Structure formats: structure tokens, C-alpha cells
Amino acid sequence: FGKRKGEGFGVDKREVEVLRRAEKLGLVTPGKTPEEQLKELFLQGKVVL
Amino acid sequence: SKLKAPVFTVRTQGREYGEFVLEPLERGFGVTLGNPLRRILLSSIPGTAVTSVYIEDVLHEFSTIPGVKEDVVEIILNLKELVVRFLNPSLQTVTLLLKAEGPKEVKARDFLPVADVEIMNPDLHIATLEEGGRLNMEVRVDRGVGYVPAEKHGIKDRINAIPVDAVFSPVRRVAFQVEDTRLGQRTDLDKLTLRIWTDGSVTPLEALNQAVEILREHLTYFSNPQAAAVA
Amino acid sequence: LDSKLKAPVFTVRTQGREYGEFVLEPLERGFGVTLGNPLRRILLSSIPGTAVTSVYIEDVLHEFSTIPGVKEDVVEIILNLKELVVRFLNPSLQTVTLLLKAEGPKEVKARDFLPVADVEIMNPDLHIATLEEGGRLNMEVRVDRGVGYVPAEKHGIKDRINAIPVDAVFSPVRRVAFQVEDTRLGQRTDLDKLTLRIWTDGSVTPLEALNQAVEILREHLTYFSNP
Amino acid sequence: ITQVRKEKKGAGLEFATPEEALAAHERGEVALNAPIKVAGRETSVGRLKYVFANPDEALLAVAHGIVDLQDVVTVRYMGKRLETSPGRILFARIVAEAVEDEKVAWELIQLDV
Amino acid sequence: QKRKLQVGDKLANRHGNKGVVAKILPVEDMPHLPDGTPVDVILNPLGV
Ligand SMILES: [Mg+2]
Ligand SMILES: [Mg+2]
Ligand SMILES: [Mg+2]
Incomplete structure (x- = not known):
């Protein structure tokens, strides 16, 4: 991820939608930043696809 | 209230890598433009x-x-x-x-x-x-x-x-980013960025060009309607 | 290695101003969904x-x-x-x-x-x-x-x-459906057959809708021209 | 596609008029699919906020990201005002088109599960 | 003879998950990561 952040790209719209979905599933905690949530998923071995 | 031609940015490193930005675009056009090009870039580039x-x-x-x-x-x-x-x-x-x-x-x-x-x-x-x-x-x-x-x-x-x-295929990898952007009072606009990695045989820019050409030419195929008679 | 083949024939089936079916075959592998998805997105979102x-x-x-x-x-x-x-x-x-x-x-x-x-x-x-x-x-x-x-x-x-x-x-377009089926021309077995199905309200016909849709796309392709 | 969302944020708040409910949801005080009560009858924000004249409109909205197939909503289908998800409408239309009969198909399926 | 993997060949992991290759997709049809990296293999979760 950090590689991406340095490369000059922020969080994708699709990533936002998937984050909303996962937030409804109770996979990530509400209120955290997109990066924090993506990390929360990544620790569960899951990634946006 | 109709969006018009977006600014097109180009960032290249050597002959191997490139990033191509198009903004602002109407909602959903990040994927609409981005994905077909990726599919063509990964497959049909000579x-x-x-x-x-x-x-x-x-x-x-x-x-x-x-x-x-x-x-x-x-x-x-x-x-x-x-x-x-x-x-x-x-x-x-x-x-x-x-x-x-x-x-x-x-x-x-x-x-x-x-x-x-x-x-x-x-x-x-x-x-x-x-x-x-x-x-x-x-x-x-x-x-x-x-x-x-x-x-x-x-x-x-x-x-x-x-x-x-x-x-x-000269093309090693293709990704595309869709980021949130705005023009004036309009929100939820798409900012499209095509990231293209090649082998150096052809540059990412060339690849993008002929990919666009392939999609264009393919769109030319709708220009000759033909009646289908099942009766 | 050598590859040369004919341009696809565009087939049209239309009932009234409400509905139409659009068949494009043969296409190179994968191009069925390469054309189909953007058109579906455009047809639903961008048609006046x-x-x-x-x-x-x-x-x-x-x-x-x-x-x-x-x-x-x-x-x-x-x-x-x-x-x-x-x-x-x-x-x-x-x-x-x-x-x-x-x-x-x-x-x-x-x-x-x-x-x-x-x-x-x-x-x-x-x-x-x-x-x-x-x-x-x-x-x-x-x-x-x-x-x-x-x-x-x-x-x-x-x-x-x-x-x-x-x-x-x-949207004058009420629904868009598309399906890609494998088709063969001679010894090429992976070719695509694109079928589009468009429902409108009659204000704009399906063929008109598709035509407007492909034009929007082509115009967007011209945006890669001058940096 | 045929399962509906059950949300805990609103959790049975009482409201007088649907405008107040829509306002509460607007502030983020009530979830879209949360089982609230307006005018003494149990309903949800989603049923009030989105009322579709027909399946094509509802699925058009789902296509635009306005709602999700699992959201409970109000859809007008076959002269009936239905509280259900767009997804169940989609299933209904799948069976319907498959058998090429709308009435019989409507009779065959169970929409509410 | 040099045998490439083909449709109907048997694949397995060490945990007892076995399956025959039913489809070989071109790379552009593959699910991919946001960085543009396509996956190699798609395994059904229903087998777990
Ligand atoms: Mg095929
Ligand atoms: Mg409403
Ligand atoms: Mg019944």
C-alpha cells in the first residue's frame, strides 16, 4: 500500500464502495480512514479485487 | 450542464513505464474508458x-x-x-x-x-x-x-x-485508478489514470495509442446495420 | 503465427420503438465483453x-x-x-x-x-x-x-x-442486457458472439440509443489525443 | 440476491410523519434498513425514501448505485405496492422471463423469503 | 513429449483439495488486484 501512497495515488472509488460493503458485513470498523479499513481487511487475508 | 473535453496528462519513465491521466470525466467513465483499454492492452498489442x-x-x-x-x-x-x-x-x-x-x-x-x-x-x-x-x-x-x-x-x-x-505482447502490466474529482459545482466526477508497464520493445504511450485505435476500429463495426430475418 | 481475418457483420433485430437486439460476430477472444460493458454503462447513464x-x-x-x-x-x-x-x-x-x-x-x-x-x-x-x-x-x-x-x-x-x-x-433506456457466446469461424474456436438487448420508452429507439452510445465512446477516445 | 438487510442503527425509533424519519436518517441517526415505526405502523426508512413506479426504475437505481439489491424498498409491480428488495423483484423477473408467463410466475415464487 | 497443463488435468494441494482444470482464461478476464496483478488460480470457497 505505502508504495501506492508514495506513487501519488489515493484510494480508489471502487475501493470505497467495497469498503462500504465490508463495513456493512462488520469486516471493518466504521469511522476509520480508507487505508485503516483496507489494512483491517488485509489482516483478515482479504483484498479488494 | 454537459461536461466537455478533459485535460490529458502524460507521465513517462524511460521506455518501460507510463501513467496517463484524464480528468475530469463524468461519473462511471473511469471504468467505462479504463477497463476496455486494459483488456486490449493486455491482449491485442502487437x-x-x-x-x-x-x-x-x-x-x-x-x-x-x-x-x-x-x-x-x-x-x-x-x-x-x-x-x-x-x-x-x-x-x-x-x-x-x-x-x-x-x-x-x-x-x-x-x-x-x-x-x-x-x-x-x-x-x-x-x-x-x-x-x-x-x-x-x-x-x-x-x-x-x-x-x-x-x-x-x-x-x-x-x-x-x-x-x-x-x-x-510487449505489455507486462496494466492497471487503472479511478479517483474522486470535481469541476466547479459538480461532484462525484471521475479522474482516470492508466498505469502501463511494458518491456521496452514498445513504449506505454504507443501501446495506449494503438489500443485506443483498436477500440475505435471496433466501434466502426456497428456502422453497418443488417436486418435479421427469422421469418 | 499468421493471423488475418474478416471484419464482423452487424446484425439487427427490432420490434417497434420499444425494443431491439443487436448481434456482432465474429469477434476476437474477449472482445465480446470489451465492447459490451462500456456500451451498457453508457446506454444506462449517458443517453439524453x-x-x-x-x-x-x-x-x-x-x-x-x-x-x-x-x-x-x-x-x-x-x-x-x-x-x-x-x-x-x-x-x-x-x-x-x-x-x-x-x-x-x-x-x-x-x-x-x-x-x-x-x-x-x-x-x-x-x-x-x-x-x-x-x-x-x-x-x-x-x-x-x-x-x-x-x-x-x-x-x-x-x-x-x-x-x-x-x-x-x-434515461430513455429502461434496460440493457448483453451476453457473449463462443462462436467459431473455420478453425478459430475461441471467437466471441456479442448480443445486446435494449429496452427504451419509445422516445429514443434502441438503435438510436446504441448509435448515440457508441458515438459518446468514440468521442471519449479522442481525449487521449492532445496533452 | 434474494436476502434482505437487517440493520441495527435505527432500532425501532418512533416517528410521527415520514418527513421526520427521513430527516433522522438524513442526519445519520437511523439506518436505511432499520425497523422503525411511523404513524404506529412498523416500517423502514428505505420503504419511505425510495418508492419506485416499476421494476425497471428500481433496477435502474441499483445500477446507478442509489440502492443495493438487498435494501428493503418500495416497488410498484403488477398493480401492487410492494415492500421488498430490488433483488427479489429481479428474481421474480428472472422466473417470469424464463417461463414467458408473468401471472403464473408470480403465482409460483415466494417473494417474501 | 513436453506436456503443458490443459483442461481436464488434475490439480491438488497438500490439504486434500483436488480438482480438474475446467477453464483457462486469458489474462484480461482474470480477477486482479488494484495494482494490476492478475490472480493465477480461482478456487471455489464452497469446497472448504
Ligand atoms: Mg471467448
Ligand atoms: Mg422517494
Ligand atoms: Mg405467490
């Missing part, structure tokens, strides 16, 4: 690859050579990584001649130079030669598109030549 | 159309109120107003306001709306409301040109205090 290999005193792929560490299967596996750039667009095929003896580590740079032919990866390993070890090769490299297995093309120059699996 | 964006009814405060003398509630009338298909005869025209005043026992249709210059109503037999004895309906509807789908809260337009904002269904 390029070059080794289509055949002849080695002296080698009857087939299943053989080894005295003084050479790598077997022929490995030699071909290495030659399959060879990136060959053609300058003149008219040129279809080139036979690269290599003659070497050891001890030395034979690289792709050791190939005898040809007019309007540039190896984009001279440091690519080919073989490991030992005292007394002698390697003489003729490798046929062709223009082409997509993935054509050795089984399909069966290309053999001379009798003992070995057909090689050919991956023609 | 008309919609009812606002409604005002006499003696009616909010959307969930009722109308004395009329059986349908305000909700049900707004629904029918969404199914109203209005076609603008002139490109200059952006927005119109259509007035309807009727009473006594009647069944009000879309044809009852007072005609406006360069405004055509495609579905005159569409049923807006039924009025009883003593039933009084006086209403004005705001019709705009736009694209895609805008919920009522997003545009939120009001000409006056009692005007109720309506979900704007702009």
Missing part, C-alpha cells in the same frame, strides 16, 4: 518474440551440450525472456546469430548486431559456458500478437530447429 | 432524455398526504408521473412546466395535459388519476432534460413552498 532456435549439434529440445551448464530446455526458457525491438516497421523477422566459447557467461548482448535491431535487455542471461564449451545458435524472432504456443506455429528454419513458445 | 423533476398540487402539503375526492394518494400519482414519456421536439428547449386542471367524475390521462410548443407526449393513454364527484385536481409538473437517474433529494428543486421533488428518471 510485438516481438523468439519463434525458433537452432543450436549446432543439437537435434531437439531434450538434449544437453558439452561445456554448457544449462540444458536446451533452460536455454530456450531464457531465450523466451529475450526482448527484441525492431526499428523499421516493414521488417517481419530477424535471425539473431550467436557464436561463443568458454569459459564465459553468455548474455543476450553477445548476439551479433543486426541493422535496425535493438535488444532491450542485454544483461539477460543465456548460457554458462565452460572450458571447451562451445555454443553456436541461430534464433528466429518474429513480429506477432498475443500468445502463440510452439505447438501451434511449428516454426522451423532448418531441419534441427526447435519451435519456441512465443509471447508477443 | 426527459423526466418529471417536480410536482405541485393544490391543497397538498407533503408527498405522503392524501387527496380528498381522489382515490389515489399523492405517492401513486407521482409514480404515474415517472412513467410519463415526454419528447422534446427542439434541441434548444431545456425545461417545461405542464399544467393539468380537471374535476367532476373523470379518469385523467396523460393526454389531458395542456399542449406545449415542441413538446410531444408519447404515452397519452397513461393513467394519472381517477376523480370522483366533487373531486378536484389542479397540478403543475416540472419536466427537464437530463441523463441517467437522479433521486428527488439530489436535485431538490422547488418552484414554490408546496412543490414536491420527484425522482428524475431521465
Whole structure:
């Protein structure tokens, strides 16, 4: 991820939608930043696809 | 309230990598434009690859050579990584001649130079030669598109030549980012960025151009409606 | 290695102004979905159309109120107003306001709306409301040109205090379906057969819709031209 | 596609008029699919906020990201005002188109599960 | 003979998950990561 952040790209719209979905599933905690949530998923071995 | 032509930004590093930005775009057009181009970039972009290999005193792929560490299967596996750039667009095929003896580590740079032919990866390993070890090769490299297995093309120059699996696509990787953007009082607009990694044979920009051309030409196919009579 | 093959034939099947089927074969591997998806996205989102964006009814405060003398509630009338298909005869025209005043026992249709210059109503037999004895309906509807789908809260337009904002269904295209089937030409077995299915409201035909859709796409491809 | 969302944010708050409910949801005080009560009858914000004249509109909205197939909502289908998800409408239309009969198909399926 | 993997060939992992290759997609049809990296293999979760 950090590689991406340095490369000059922020969080994708699709990533936002998937984050909303996962937030409804109770996979990530509400209120955290997109990066924090993506990390929360990544620790569960899951990634946006 | 109709959006109009977006600014188009280009960022290139060498011949290998590129980023292409289009903003602002209407909602959903990041994917609408981005994805088809990616599909075309990964598949239909023409390029070059080794289509055949002849080695002296080698009857087939299943053989080894005295003084050479790598077997022929490995030699071909290495030659399959060879990136060959053609300058003149008219040129279809080139036979690269290599003659070497050891001890030395034979690289792709050791190939005898040809007019309007540039190896984009001279440091690519080919073989490991030992005292007394002698390697003489003729490798046929062709223009082409997509993935054509050795089984399909069966290309053999001379009798003992070995057909090689050919991956023609110059494009190594394609990704596209869709970021949130705004113009004036309009929100939820798309900012599209195409990231293109190639092998150096063709630049990301060229790839993007001919990909766009392929999609355009494909859109030209809707221009001739024909009545379908099931009755 | 050698590859040379013929350009695909575009096949058209059309029933009325409502529906059409579009077949494109043969295509190179994968190109069935390469063409199909963007077109579907464009056909749904970007095709120019008309919609009812606002409604005002006499003696009616909010959307969930009722109308004395009329059986349908305000909700049900707004629904029918969404199914109203209005076609603008002139490109200059952006927005119109259509007035309807009727009473006594009647069944009000879309044809009852007072005609406006360069405004055509495609579905005159569409049923807006039924009025009883003593039933009084006086209403004005705001019709705009736009694209895609805008919920009522997003545009939120009001000409006056009692005007109720309506979900704007702009898209003349009601549905788009596409399917890719494997097809073969000679010894090429991986080729694609593209089939498109488009439902419209009649204001814009499916073929017109597809044509407008592919044009939008081509025009977007020209945006990679000058940095 | 045929399962519906059950949300805990609103969790049975009482409201007088649907405008108040829509306002509460607007502030983020009530989830879209949360089982609230307006005018003494149990309903949800989604049923009030989105009322579709027909399946094509509802699925068009789903296509635009306005709602999700699992959201409970109000859809007008076959002269009936239905509280259900767009997804169940989709299933209904799948069966319907498959058998080429709308009435019989409507009779065969169970929409509410 | 040099045998490439083909449709109907048997694949397995060390945990007892076995399956025959039913489809070989071109790379552009493959699910991919946001960085543009396509996956190699798609295994059905229903097998777990
Ligand atoms: Mg195919
Ligand atoms: Mg509503
Ligand atoms: Mg039933």
C-alpha cells in the first residue's frame, strides 16, 4: 500500500464502495480512514479485487 | 450542464513505464474508458518474440551440450525472456546469430548486431559456458500478437530447429485508478489514470495509442446495420 | 503465427420503438465483453432524455398526504408521473412546466395535459388519476432534460413552498442486457458472439440509443489525443 | 440476491410523519434498513425514501448505485405496492422471463423469503 | 513429449483439495488486484 501512497495515488472509488460493503458485513470498523479499513481487511487475508 | 473535453496528462519513465491521466470525466467513465483499454492492452498489442532456435549439434529440445551448464530446455526458457525491438516497421523477422566459447557467461548482448535491431535487455542471461564449451545458435524472432504456443506455429528454419513458445505482447502490466474529482459545482466526477508497464520493445504511450485505435476500429463495426430475418 | 481475418457483420433485430437486439460476430477472444460493458454503462447513464423533476398540487402539503375526492394518494400519482414519456421536439428547449386542471367524475390521462410548443407526449393513454364527484385536481409538473437517474433529494428543486421533488428518471433506456457466446469461424474456436438487448420508452429507439452510445465512446477516445 | 438487510442503527425509533424519519436518517441517526415505526405502523426508512413506479426504475437505481439489491424498498409491480428488495423483484423477473408467463410466475415464487 | 497443463488435468494441494482444470482464461478476464496483478488460480470457497 505505502508504495501506492508514495506513487501519488489515493484510494480508489471502487475501493470505497467495497469498503462500504465490508463495513456493512462488520469486516471493518466504521469511522476509520480508507487505508485503516483496507489494512483491517488485509489482516483478515482479504483484498479488494 | 454537459461536461466537455478533459485535460490529458502524460507521465513517462524511460521506455518501460507510463501513467496517463484524464480528468475530469463524468461519473462511471473511469471504468467505462479504463477497463476496455486494459483488456486490449493486455491482449491485442502487437510485438516481438523468439519463434525458433537452432543450436549446432543439437537435434531437439531434450538434449544437453558439452561445456554448457544449462540444458536446451533452460536455454530456450531464457531465450523466451529475450526482448527484441525492431526499428523499421516493414521488417517481419530477424535471425539473431550467436557464436561463443568458454569459459564465459553468455548474455543476450553477445548476439551479433543486426541493422535496425535493438535488444532491450542485454544483461539477460543465456548460457554458462565452460572450458571447451562451445555454443553456436541461430534464433528466429518474429513480429506477432498475443500468445502463440510452439505447438501451434511449428516454426522451423532448418531441419534441427526447435519451435519456441512465443509471447508477443510487449505489455507486462496494466492497471487503472479511478479517483474522486470535481469541476466547479459538480461532484462525484471521475479522474482516470492508466498505469502501463511494458518491456521496452514498445513504449506505454504507443501501446495506449494503438489500443485506443483498436477500440475505435471496433466501434466502426456497428456502422453497418443488417436486418435479421427469422421469418 | 499468421493471423488475418474478416471484419464482423452487424446484425439487427427490432420490434417497434420499444425494443431491439443487436448481434456482432465474429469477434476476437474477449472482445465480446470489451465492447459490451462500456456500451451498457453508457446506454444506462449517458443517453439524453426527459423526466418529471417536480410536482405541485393544490391543497397538498407533503408527498405522503392524501387527496380528498381522489382515490389515489399523492405517492401513486407521482409514480404515474415517472412513467410519463415526454419528447422534446427542439434541441434548444431545456425545461417545461405542464399544467393539468380537471374535476367532476373523470379518469385523467396523460393526454389531458395542456399542449406545449415542441413538446410531444408519447404515452397519452397513461393513467394519472381517477376523480370522483366533487373531486378536484389542479397540478403543475416540472419536466427537464437530463441523463441517467437522479433521486428527488439530489436535485431538490422547488418552484414554490408546496412543490414536491420527484425522482428524475431521465434515461430513455429502461434496460440493457448483453451476453457473449463462443462462436467459431473455420478453425478459430475461441471467437466471441456479442448480443445486446435494449429496452427504451419509445422516445429514443434502441438503435438510436446504441448509435448515440457508441458515438459518446468514440468521442471519449479522442481525449487521449492532445496533452 | 434474494436476502434482505437487517440493520441495527435505527432500532425501532418512533416517528410521527415520514418527513421526520427521513430527516433522522438524513442526519445519520437511523439506518436505511432499520425497523422503525411511523404513524404506529412498523416500517423502514428505505420503504419511505425510495418508492419506485416499476421494476425497471428500481433496477435502474441499483445500477446507478442509489440502492443495493438487498435494501428493503418500495416497488410498484403488477398493480401492487410492494415492500421488498430490488433483488427479489429481479428474481421474480428472472422466473417470469424464463417461463414467458408473468401471472403464473408470480403465482409460483415466494417473494417474501 | 513436453506436456503443458490443459483442461481436464488434475490439480491438488497438500490439504486434500483436488480438482480438474475446467477453464483457462486469458489474462484480461482474470480477477486482479488494484495494482494490476492478475490472480493465477480461482478456487471455489464452497469446497472448504
Ligand atoms: Mg471467448
Ligand atoms: Mg422517494
Ligand atoms: Mg405467490
